[PDB]
Design a protein around this ligand. Structure first.
Ligand code: NAP
Lengths: 489, 490, 488, 489
């Protein structure tokens, strides 16, 4: 009795338990879940990797240890008592054969529910999926598979990578990851919109001038530039995160909070988006900053791991349109990039000027902002009479900052909420087959054209806000930026 | 034109009834603060006038007033009084008023100067004072404006008569009728909040609002001078003037401009759609002392010697009004006020309708917009948010703006400062107009008479409580939904 | 419903000899009597410079318009109520005996007096002066009806309007604008404020533009000399069209009370910025060689008109109302003489539907209210092409008074107007401030036109007018679809 | 091509060609389609039935003949040259075996598209479906089956049947009939709503007070009362026709005019309807009228074919609600019945009183009416200043009557447009599996309760408007009727 809406044994298999993702995220998260007592009484964690690692308490406690607490020492040891290891190659039935045995070896292993987390590279996916289905499936109880990277590099190829999994496991077993869907503020979007009347009748083309979905990271490609170069900022962030936020911000009210009823409304939106036009795109690549220090001086190409003549973009601003009765004509600006002046992700709606102005154009457009991170907050920039002996109005805002209002409660990491969702069996925060299909449908034409004609991205100094061209794009499409807005704490 | 923040002309601020309580405790201090912050024009002189052959500017004056003096200000302070002067005389014999006029012309350029007469004295005298001023003290050159303190009289007859009297001597654009609430920061802000924001436009109407509540509460009872208040009753005292005004600002249609008259027009247009108050939508109450309290808290209304032992005058009243027009047809405006209550506040609150087609299994609560006029001026909207943390269900929370933190520097001016300045700058927008006054009486007199006739006994409520339970029962019946399930932290 | 039950009333027709009197005022007043709308004790007193015999004499010889055989009885009955008086519109002596003659009538000193000024604006100043001194009734009301409020200049019209306002108070002055009395024009208010199907749509969010049209098939029938002093703007736009605009754009009034309504009207005018020379198209008609009769003679071919005139006979102007409801929506006022037909209508073209699913086969909806002829109101909308078809096409929901209400005869504007004067309803009459705002808007343009004397665009008699006008409408927002069929 | 975005052979197999439905509706219709040259050039008609029938031209021109024209004699004989007959039982593979053979015997039978119309009793459906799938399916070209009565009777026995057909044929071959979806005015509903701005912003709870879907027949159960007694008016008309109209009236704007995109929007509506409450139901049974003549004197029970102690309803008025942001709270009144005063089927919406009345309650609520039949017309009752010397307003209306406005064009019978739809492959006007499901989901609880407690229906004299109680229901739920409305031609 936990899932907010008897007990049995569960086995959390961590495929690629030796990988960076496993030791730095997956493992920590699973322990936190156990720590707060969210994991069912009978749970066992079984790591699996290519290497024959030292003891299930020796190595896997040596490598991971992120956020340990002195007084937690007891429960900590208690946790490892649930942990175990198995080594093997990700392709020879022999290795997978002893894994299965090992699980049945566990108290009630044949009865337990099996949850497989694929914390490893997309290449191996095809094979891993294959093996798991044959030799490791539980005869009783459920089996679920979590895919860390639902993306490939091409439509028709990822179509096969996808299809293959779909021919072995049915959709209600496939849990595709997009961690942003598990962040406090992102989930909140649905509540803010559908449980409030002050936001209902305004959410439409008659009131909204444009929507801006932003994603910024202050650091560049910390040495591993070689890897990133294969995907490009679009495939890395825009295609998945921003798009999801877009869906949540534009979908129609669902029949209920049921996983599928919600996802249905999401995809319905995607089906109304026409393919991206090259005319609404701005690409940029970062160059090192001479006045900086450390990584700040080294530009993208200064990374030895990246091919000397690369044109891969680290920054991209794209404009999309939703063609339906509600958003017809409203621009959705997706802007993202690495090596910028800060770190943040927010949704911002700028509304239309008030009709029949009686204040001699002193007014500025209202805006609703939902800051996902950092310092999760939501506020509405509006007008108010300039306080004091003044007649004219000025900008101000109605604010809600979780940091002060809810100073006690600690916000869980995306992964905790997500994994728990998996235990509960709530696919609502996970990507569905058709959602994937539509995401490719929209971007492939552009992506293809980019690789073909290989456009040279606009250079932008490390630490700036990016190419001026991006701002000029936003303005042209409808966004009005007012540098006249003061803020204090 | 200029934002009243720029004016060289000479100006004369005559304080009629300069010896009165209001003069020495509010008018005088306010005029000095205006001077102190350099808001009054360079050539401005202050002339106090009163019955007593009072000891000049530096003598009985500065002795009586002194409210909020600052050490290092001593210079500008003395500078101020060099501009001050006094004149004694009776409020009815031409002879006295004759020398007043002379005294003004005596001042450097008195005959050219703009004259502003603040009537800081009892309504009885208004008739005569107004009569004389018009004859012997009017300036031949430059404007002449008269500030009227108490726009309302004892009876419907008495006031309508006087208004007509003043209106025959002076034209509307010289008459500045006072209702100090119109000069409070938050009350003025109402218009900006409504008409300069799109997030508040398409929601302000019967399709989205369930009810509006205008509240006015004072924690103290009638501090000893119960005798006076007894004549007026809570309705005349607060509801008829203040609360009604806020109602106008909350329900008026968008004006053609910010021009004083264009605005006032839209205000009265609203009053014209309010049907006379029904005795069925009224809750009256009178306060009784509290035995567990201390000091004044133990003495009830009737325990005041100044009040007639068998009084039935109300100290609390909750009334429901309706505006019959395309916008507010059917929406209840609840005006609730009272003395000797649990706190001190004045706010406007709008409660919106339940969302249509609920998908959260009635866990939702109606949204609300709150504009707290005082204390700690703030405005906020109570809405729903996903319970923070590992939770799926939503809970109440709010988007807030508190002037005390966001604007911790700027000091908010007293209503009278902004108002008096308005008089200098010639902006009648924050003052009551003849027709507004009438519509006010039009609405309340039928009820007021009935009360004086049948003399209903008010419901007793212990000093310090929130008032008669019946009032709350009224609010609920008429449309308001209250739910004590709302937490708040700083 | 028409409900001091019956008091005596005197209908003084000043200028009883004039064309307007014998051709409109007299006939109308008799129609009101005939149908039994006039109070029992009513007497008609014509007055004019000449001494046109007795009542039943020249004033039955001159008028006679629409007589019916069997009515002969009531007809004679009517004239027994009529009388006449001669005199000059300026010497106290004449007006003196007029007053006497009125008191001579059964209860003249008790009777209500209604002075209809059916004479030229020049004399107004005088007539008004005299009537106030020697002809005012000591008991009962006195109401004066001003045929033309608008004069030649702004300085003059104003001076006059105020001269009258210093003698009589607003509630005695009944300024005319006959269009306010036409069936369909009054109906506007009911169509808008008594229906829900039209409420939420009447605003910038749905409406793309509004067109107020006024067309006459005939040119200036010989009397071109007189018209030349005003020009089409002052003649039709400045007054009629503008009024229709008011009724179409005003906010809902506090009640149907004359003043509560008029207030909402002028509120609109106050939000209209001065007309820009850039949104104006002027035209002057030229005769048609293939026509016949008047159709061959152009404007300048009229001897009465100065050989080198630049006065416009056609004008298309665009106006804007700057307020929360109409901000941005264009009001197209188009009018002209010597065109292809005769009609006056209000038309609203709505916006394209959002999120089209029929592959642009749709056309904008429109609401039309035809004031005349064949008074009707309809909405052009979309409907699935009837039969074995899937795609939609245009059609309409219609209401034509000619068939739906084939019995009832619609009264001439003047009947309803005059009656309104008797009942005391200024709602259908122009108010002082309304006139001021009307002047406020057009004088800037009007003066510029006279200053720079622009040459109007010539348009052949009988055509729809200058193409430029259409180009204006399109530019400003109007979309014309030649694809719309109509049968009976 | 007719529809927008050749000549293969086609075979129209009329299963149950001897039955009343065949000779009286199916056969005539197919000939009309042929007559207007709407059927493909290469089309052949094959009637199949139990009884050893004389030649098509022999015995099957004698039974049908409905709507023949003198001068059409030529094309008439031409038509019969395409017809043919086959006799056999609906169960023994032997019969079906020779049918298939006969089809292949036709010029290009093996290539031809096969269309199977099921014009026979629901009992045989299971078998026929079975046999057709085995021996008669076409190797090349499409195979579509048309079902006459998609509704059986009870949720389960009517689930069973569906599941059987859906296991032999896939959704895109099953064309479920509900002829009302093929009537001019019913189709028009979608165009009226979604192609007009004058009707957009009004279609919602903020403006509409109630919706009434009416279906009336002046004649009673003409002798064959026995058959009707098994279903009752609800199953017979309400559960199907009316409901469909409700869907079309309340559905949200679809992503496109694509058959499935539409149907999706339809079912989305049904999913929001809570089960019918016995408190919102009025049942009635007709009694004969002594002043009448002919059938008008014999009441329901006077029909020998009907069980002497029957309680089956010939009339029913039910109130349903759609719980969603658009229609939350608005009552949908579905009223129908036999032996009434007239014959008509219409959709009517009554709007709310204008807010802030200034005409001293002289106003009456606006209404939009779309009369499906007879004399198809659509109009809006509104207020207009009483014409003439009057100040006060009165009722009137903006009207559009097809009979006058479109006096030339003849409107096709539902079955013509429907059958053509099948050839064209447009399932948009046909019922989908999930739609039926939801239909029974809503009514079964009620239907059961009725057959259990056997309530006695309110008697209503033949020829009246029905039980006063029904009108009292309508008023109670919100509908305001004011007999003050005059109408002329
Ligand atoms: N920005 C800020 O500083 C800030 C922001 C949000 C909240 N807060 C604090 O939050 C606390 C509660 O917030 P709130 O005042 O907005 O909402 P609330 O207390 O839930 O209710 C507000 C209204 O309910 C009335 N009420 C209370 N109990 C009632 C009953 N039994 N029957 C009928 N009416 C009843 C209250 O009366 P009374 O008026 O007589 O109390 C008041 O008018 C307050 O102290 C508020 O100041 C402060």
């Amino acid at each position: 009795h936990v899932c907010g809406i008897q007990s049995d044994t569960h086995i959390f298999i961590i495929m690629g338990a030796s990988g960076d993702l496993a030791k730095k995220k997956i493992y920590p998260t699973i322990w936190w879940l156990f720590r707060d007592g969210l994991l069912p009484e009978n749970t066992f964690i079984v790591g699996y990797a290519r290497s024959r690692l030292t003891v299930a308490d020796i190595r896997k406690q040596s490598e991971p240890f992120f956020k340990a607490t002195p007084e937690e020492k007891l429960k900590l040891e208690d946790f490892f008592a649930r942990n175990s290891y198995v080594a093997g190659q990700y392709d020879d039935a022999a290795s997978y054969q002893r894994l299965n045995s090992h699980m049945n070896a566990l108290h009630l292993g044949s009865q337990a529910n099996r949850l497989f987390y694929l914390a490893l590279p997309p290449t191996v996916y095809e094979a891993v999926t294959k093996n798991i289905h044959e030799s490791c499936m539980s005869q009783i109880g459920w089996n679920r598979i979590i895919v860390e990277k639902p993306f490939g590099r091409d439509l028709q190829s990822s179509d096969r990578l996808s299809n293959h999994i779909s021919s072995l496991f049915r959709e209600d077993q496939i849990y595709r990851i997009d961690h942003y869907l598990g962040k406090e503020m992102v989930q909140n979007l649905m509540v803010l919109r559908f449980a409030n009347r002050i936001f209902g009748p305004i959410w439409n083309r008659d009131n909204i001038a444009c929507v801006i979905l932003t994603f910024k990271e202050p650091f560049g490609t910390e040495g591993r530039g070689g890897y990133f170069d294969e995907f490009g900022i679009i495939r890395d962030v825009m295609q998945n995160h921003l798009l999801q936020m877009l869906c949540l911000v534009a979908m129609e009210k669902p029949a209920s909070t049921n996983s599928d009823d919600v996802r249905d409304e999401k995809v319905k939106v995607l089906k109304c988006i026409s393919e991206v036009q090259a005319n609404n795109v701005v690409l940029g690549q970062y160059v090192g900053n001479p006045d900086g220090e450390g990584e700040a001086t080294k530009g993208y190409l200064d990374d030895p791991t990246v091919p000397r003549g690369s044109t891969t973009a680290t920054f991209a601003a794209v404009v999309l349109y939703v063609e339906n009765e509600r958003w017809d004509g409203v621009p959705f600006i997706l802007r993202c990039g690495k090596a910028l002046n800060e770190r943040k992700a927010e949704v911002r709606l700028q509304f239309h000027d008030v009709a029949g102005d009686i204040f001699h154009q002193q007014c500025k457009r209202n805006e609703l902002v939902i800051r996902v991170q950092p310092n999760e907050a939501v506020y509405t920039k509006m007008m108010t009479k300039k306080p004091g002996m003044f007649f004219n109005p000025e900008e101000s805002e109605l604010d809600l900052t979780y940091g002060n209002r809810y100073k006690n409660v600690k916000l869980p990491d995306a992964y905790e909420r997500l994994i728990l969702d998996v235990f509960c069996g709530s696919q609502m925060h996970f990507v569905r087959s058709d959602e994937l299909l539509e995401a490719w449908r929209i971007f492939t034409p552009l992506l293809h054209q980019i690789e073909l004609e290989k456009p040279k991205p606009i250079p932008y100094i490390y630490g700036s806000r990016g190419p001026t061209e991006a701002d000029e794009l936003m303005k042209r499409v409808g966004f009005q930026y007012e540098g006249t807005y003061k803020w204090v704490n």
